[PDB]
């Protein structure tokens, strides 16, 4: 739902700032590798 | 309205929220949260407006 909301909001916006991704990516994640893989897939 | 959306109520829970945002996932304490927050902007060796 959360990251799903992020994906759909991006796909309607056509873009995504780093801020919006940070707000929408989960909070359990601590490392930056999963975060950068999420950013790569989402791009 | 911000205080509506604001889930915390006091300095303890607010510091815990800040700690979770900065150093995520780690189990917070009162002491660790307070120390992180005070080392953010009000410890002279880690924040400098020149």
Swiss-Prot record, chain B:
<comment type="similarity">
    <text>Belongs to the RNA polymerase beta chain family.</text>
</comment>
<comment type="subunit">
    <text>The RNAP catalytic core consists of 2 alpha, 1 beta, 1 beta' and 1 omega subunit. When a sigma factor is associated with the core the holoenzyme is formed, which can initiate transcription.</text>
</comment>
<protein>
    <recommendedName>
        <fullName>DNA-directed RNA polymerase subunit beta</fullName>
    </recommendedName>
</protein>
<comment type="function">
    <text>DNA-dependent RNA polymerase catalyzes the transcription of DNA into RNA using the four ribonucleoside triphosphates as substrates.</text>
</comment>
